[PDB]
Amino acid sequence: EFPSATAKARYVRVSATKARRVIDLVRGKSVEEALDILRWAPQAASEPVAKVIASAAANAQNNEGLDPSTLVVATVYADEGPTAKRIRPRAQGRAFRIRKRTSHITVIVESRPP
Amino acid sequence: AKRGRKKRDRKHSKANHGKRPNA
Amino acid sequence: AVPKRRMSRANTRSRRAQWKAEAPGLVTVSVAGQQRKVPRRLLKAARLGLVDLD
Amino acid sequence: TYAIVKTGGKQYKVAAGDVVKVEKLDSEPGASVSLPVALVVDGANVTSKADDLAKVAVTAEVLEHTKGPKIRIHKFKNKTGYHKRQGHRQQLTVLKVTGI
Amino acid sequence: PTYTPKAGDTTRSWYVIDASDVVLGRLASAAATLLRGKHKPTFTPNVDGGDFVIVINADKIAVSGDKLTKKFAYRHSGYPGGLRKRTIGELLEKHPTRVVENAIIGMLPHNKLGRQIQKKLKVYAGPDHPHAAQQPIPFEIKQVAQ
Amino acid sequence: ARVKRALNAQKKRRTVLKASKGYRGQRSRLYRKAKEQQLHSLTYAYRDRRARKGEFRKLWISRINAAARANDITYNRLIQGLKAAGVEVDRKNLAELAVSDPAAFTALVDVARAALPEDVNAPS
RNA sequence: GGUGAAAAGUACCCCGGGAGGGGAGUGAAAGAGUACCUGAAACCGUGCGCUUACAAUCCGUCAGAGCCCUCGACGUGUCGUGGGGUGAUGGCGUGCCUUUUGAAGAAUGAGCCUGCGAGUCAGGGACAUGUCGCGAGGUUAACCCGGGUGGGGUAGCCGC
RNA sequence: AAGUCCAAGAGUGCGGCAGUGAGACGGCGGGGGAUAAGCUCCGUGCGUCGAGAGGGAAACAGCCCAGAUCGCCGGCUAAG
RNA sequence: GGCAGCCAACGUGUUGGCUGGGUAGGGGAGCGUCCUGCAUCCGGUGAAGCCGCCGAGUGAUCGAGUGGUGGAGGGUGUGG
Numbered sequence: 102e103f104p105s106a107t108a109k110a111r112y113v114r115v116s117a118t119k120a121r122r123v124i125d126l127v128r129g130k131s132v133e134e135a136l137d138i139l140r141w142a143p144q145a146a147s148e149p150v151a152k153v154i155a156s157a158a159a160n161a162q163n164n165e166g167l168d169p170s171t172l173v174v175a176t177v178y179a180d181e182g183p184t185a186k187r188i189r190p191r192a193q194g195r196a197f198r199i200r201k202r203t204s205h206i207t208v209i210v211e212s213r214p215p
Numbered sequence: 216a217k218r219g220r221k222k223r224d225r226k227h228s229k230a231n232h233g234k235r236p237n238a
Numbered sequence: 239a240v241p242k243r244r245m246s247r248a249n250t251r252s253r254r255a256q257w258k259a260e261a262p263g264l265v266t267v268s269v270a271g272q273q274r275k276v277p278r279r280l281l282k283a284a285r286l287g288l289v290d291l292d
Numbered sequence: 293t294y295a296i297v298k299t300g301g302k303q304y305k306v307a308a309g310d311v312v313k314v315e316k317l318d319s320e321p322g323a324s325v326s327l328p329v330a331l332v333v334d335g336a337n338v339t340s341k342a343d344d345l346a347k348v349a350v351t352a353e354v355l356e357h358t359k360g361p362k363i364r365i366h367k368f369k370n371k372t373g374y375h376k377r378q379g380h381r382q383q384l385t386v387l388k389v390t391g392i
Numbered sequence: 393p394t395y396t397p398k399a400g401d402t403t404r405s406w407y408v409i410d411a412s413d414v415v416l417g418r419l420a421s422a423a424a425t426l427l428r429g430k431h432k433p434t435f436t437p438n439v440d441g442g443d444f445v446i447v448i449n450a451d452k453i454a455v456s457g458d459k460l461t462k463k464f465a466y467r468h469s470g471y472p473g474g475l476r477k478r479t480i481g482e483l484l485e486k487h488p489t490r491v492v493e494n495a496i497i498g499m500l501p502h503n504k505l506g507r508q509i510q511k512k513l514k515v516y517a518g519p520d521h522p523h524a525a526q527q528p529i530p531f532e533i534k535q536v537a538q
Numbered sequence: 539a540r541v542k543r544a545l546n547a548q549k550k551r552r553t554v555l556k557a558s559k560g561y562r563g564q565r566s567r568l569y570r571k572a573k574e575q576q577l578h579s580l581t582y583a584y585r586d587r588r589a590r591k592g593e594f595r596k597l598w599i600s601r602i603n604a605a606a607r608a609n610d611i612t613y614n615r616l617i618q619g620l621k622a623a624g625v626e627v628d629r630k631n632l633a634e635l636a637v638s639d640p641a642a643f644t645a646l647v648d649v650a651r652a653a654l655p656e657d658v659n660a661p662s
Numbered sequence: 663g664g665u666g667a668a669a670a671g672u673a674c675c676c677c678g679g680g681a682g683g684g685g686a687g688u689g690a691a692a693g694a695g696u697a698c699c700u701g702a703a704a705c706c707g708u709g710c711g712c713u714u715a716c717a718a719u720c721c722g723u724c725a726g727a728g729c730c731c732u733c734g735a736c737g738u739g740u741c742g743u744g745g746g747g748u749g750a751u752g753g754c755g756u757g758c759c760u761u762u763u764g765a766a767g768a769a770u771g772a773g774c775c776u777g778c779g780a781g782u783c784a785g786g787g788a789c790a791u792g793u794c795g796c797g798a799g800g801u802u803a804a805c806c807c808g809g810g811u812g813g814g815g816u817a818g819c820c821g822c
Numbered sequence: 823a824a825g826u827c828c829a830a831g832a833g834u835g836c837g838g839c840a841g842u843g844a845g846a847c848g849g850c851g852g853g854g855g856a857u858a859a860g861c862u863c864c865g866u867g868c869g870u871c872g873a874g875a876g877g878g879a880a881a882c883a884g885c886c887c888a889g890a891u892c893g894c895c896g897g898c899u900a901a902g
Numbered sequence: 903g904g905c906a907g908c909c910a911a912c913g914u915g916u917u918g919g920c921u922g923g924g925u926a927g928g929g930g931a932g933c934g935u936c937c938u939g940c941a942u943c944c945g946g947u948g949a950a951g952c953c954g955c956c957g958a959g960u961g962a963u964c965g966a967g968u969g970g971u972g973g974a975g976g977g978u979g980u981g982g
């Protein structure tokens with residue numbers, strides 16, 4: 102085991118499968134490397150996930166009191182959240198359904214040795 | 216009439232003894 | 239046309255797999271005496287201060 | 293040496309000490325049964341003649357009574373509505389062979 | 393219970409079969425027999441545990457009757473009208489080896505294990521082979537009387 | 539007296555789903571498709587439990603034939619001679635003899651050949 | 663429709679524009695946080711174990727190598743009356759239901775899960791058969807008296 | 823006159839509860855048709871399928887063998 | 903070697919002999935759910951429900967065997 106800090110972001114207005122597509126870029130990396138990768142990656146879902154990673158780092162800053170530079174994003178994933186249902190009217194009186202999906206991004210970072 | 220002849224004749228095998236459904 | 243059968247999990251996950259992103263390749267630059275990482279495309283523009291390193 | 297015992301309508305290759313799961317035998321555990329032989333191999337010579345194969349028996353001891361694996365049967369025929377469920381566990385005895 | 397081979401139980405022997413003036417079907421049937429391992433008391437249909445077979449003098453195979461001109465080998469290229477036929481005749485001097493091996497492939501099982509089994513067959517049209525390092529013992533086409 | 543039929547309904551569901559573990563696809567996830575697969579599974583188990591006794595006899599015969607022909611005798615003549623000699627060992631243990639110790643198999647082939655007619659093709 | 667016994671409904675600190683969280687506290691519990699009792703399945707991830715890129719698979723079943731876990735024994739890795747997981751490979755193998763002479767059928771129906779959805783009830787009805795009471799008899803209907811399911815009620819009805 | 827007779831699970835009579843009343847192919851006897859049809863209509867103490875699993879006929883309801891109470895890592899056979 | 907249906911023998915629970923494919927359909931005997939009369943038992947030292955483990959029964963199914971979660975009601979007998 103290694104000392105760990107957690108951060109959760111729930112009900113983020115981003116599809117889970119669109120959050121995972123940038124989560125898969127940064128899994129198992131140092132926090133600073135992950136933050137850089139997210140900051141230059143051209144998909145909008147980076148904005149939530151990046152924040153979540155940073156939030157976790159701060160917890161290890163301020164609640165475990167451990168070294169900034171040893172942090173690695175050990176576990177990160179995106180669960181589905183509640184879906185809102187809407188209607189788009191279509192041709193000849195049809196009415197199709199629209200899903201406004203959300204996500205829960207969870208990150209656990211560990212202070213591994215160098 | 217190849218299909219009919221060739222189906223109808225496989226009744227004359229040893230294991231069928233000169234008989235078979237649908238002749 | 240219309241899908242004849244519901245498609246199986248193996249075959250669904252086979253081409254959901256191709257929908258991925260690639261991480262940009264970063265290089266190091268020195269701005270205001272401290273080191274930052276930027277794409278090699280934006281290297282010059284960082285070296286003369288036209289990209290906002292937060 | 294090793295023999296081939298006859299029991300339960302089946303033949304089992306046996307050497308002293310081997311444990312064999314055979315069909316049910318009427319013998320309380322601890323009792324010693326004696327079983328006929330279909331063949332004996334001693335080193336390099338075998339006993340195949342019928343009269344002198346009848347001269348030797350294998351003596352074994354009953355260790356316990358066992359239930360075989362649970363077998364589940366579900367007979368089924370399509371479009372007729374016919375199902376039939378049942379199960380079977382076979383009764384067995386464990387024999388620790390002592391002498392040949 | 394019944395014997396099944398473990399990991400290091402299979403041992404492989406190298407047989408060289410001379411094909412000079414032998415019937416193609418007889419040679420191929422025997423080669424398939426001792427290529428599949430049907431001559432071993434440790435046979436088990438699950439395991440590929442046969443032997444290596446070299447066929448020497450695959451040129452000199454004997455084909456009885458009148459099959460050197462009226463027996464065909466058909467291949468289809470998958471394209472409409474993509475069927476070509478070569479007699480046993482043409483196939484014996486264009487490149488002869490496959491003739492012999494063709495027969496053997498038709499008497500091995502047509503499953504994945506048959507693909508693994510094929511690799512032990514080495515057919516050579518000449519009277520000599522490069523595998524002298526494995527000491528291939530000559531094999532005679534024998535029949536057991538009854 | 540209204541009943542909520544869910545306590546009783548779920549029991550067979552859990553039984554069938556627990557039996558359907560390892561099934562590839564949705565035959566291990568959905569009670570209906572798993573039940574359809576269980577029908578085939580138990581019929582196939584009956585079929586193969588019956589035919590296993592023939593598959594194993596096939597295997598024993600094949601091994602015995604190979605060992606016999608190594609000893610230069612045909613399988614059919616071998617068992618004909620063993621029947622003539624009164625040695626009454628079944629094909630299972632005869633296959634264990636063929637594999638484990640071939641010397642006893644050789645001796646038993648000797649007995650079978652010694653107890654066999656001077657002409658197997660004689661009109662008798 | 664359902665937080666908790668009681669709002670005691672999270673002071674203060676930290677990341678974040680907020681939303682959301684992490685410490686700290688409240689509480690018996692926060693796997694009770696005003697998205698709140700229990701929290702199943704479908705569906706969606708993440709981690710580990712075995713397997714899989716020369717192979718024609720109603721997707722199983724029977725035999726089965728190798729690997730992984732676990733329980734015993736002797737001992738110190740190899741057997742055992744063993745147990746699990748996964749499965750290279752080999753044999754066999756044409757979904758379910760309706761309706762049909764006959765459907766794997768290229769006939770119908772069914773995307774999936776969870777909840778729901780079809781021989782019931784009334785009547786001195788009719789016929790038959792069990793069971794019980796009384797028996798050449800058997801029984802009351804309306805009704806009357808009983809805080810009751812008890813007791814009276816011969817009109818009729820069936821047998822003769 | 824016997825046989826079967828700890829069974830055919832047989833006849834016949836009365837009653838309660840039925841389903842069925844679209845059959846198929848094969849052997850033998852025939853009508854219709856062109857002595858055609860995997861056609862159609864009858865007869866048959868004829869069979870199988872229907873409502874039948876298992877083995878053979880490559881596959882193959884109706885053909886040949888044989889009627890599945892369950893288990894066995896025993897043996898003998900049938901058609902082939 | 904295990905079960906069951908019909909029948910027989912001694913006799914009063916055994917043994918023996920025959921038999922046990924099956925749709926429409928007929929008959930018999932049962933599993934699980936809920937509500938209740940009466941009787942007993944369990945439960946904040948943790949009921950139900952759910953998720954497992956290890957097992958059991960000829961079948962529906964069972965687990966007054968066990969853990970995890972859970973937080974207030976349940977089991978069994980004999981009738982309705």
Ligand SMILES: [Mg+2]
Pocket residue numbers: 139140141142144145147148
């Ligand atoms: Mg960004």
Ligand SMILES: [Mg+2]
Pocket residue numbers: 194
């Ligand atoms: Mg409009």
Ligand SMILES: [Mg+2]
Pocket residue numbers: 196197198
């Ligand atoms: Mg729509």
Ligand SMILES: [Mg+2]
Pocket residue numbers: 216
């Ligand atoms: Mg013509």
Ligand SMILES: [Mg+2]
Pocket residue numbers: 237238
């Ligand atoms: Mg005809």
Ligand SMILES: [Mg+2]
Pocket residue numbers: 371
């Ligand atoms: Mg059918």
Ligand SMILES: [Mg+2]
Pocket residue numbers: 370371372
């Ligand atoms: Mg039908």
Ligand SMILES: [Mg+2]
Pocket residue numbers: 560561
């Ligand atoms: Mg599996």
Ligand SMILES: [Mg+2]
Pocket residue numbers: none
């Ligand atoms: Mg506290």
Ligand SMILES: [Mg+2]
Pocket residue numbers: 691
């Ligand atoms: Mg609690």
Ligand SMILES: [Mg+2]
Pocket residue numbers: none
């Ligand atoms: Mg909710």
Ligand SMILES: [Mg+2]
Pocket residue numbers: 701
């Ligand atoms: Mg809740």
Ligand SMILES: [Mg+2]
Pocket residue numbers: none
């Ligand atoms: Mg491969």
Ligand SMILES: [Mg+2]
Pocket residue numbers: none
């Ligand atoms: Mg094929």
Ligand SMILES: [Mg+2]
Pocket residue numbers: none
């Ligand atoms: Mg397979």
Ligand SMILES: [Mg+2]
Pocket residue numbers: 755
């Ligand atoms: Mg197959």
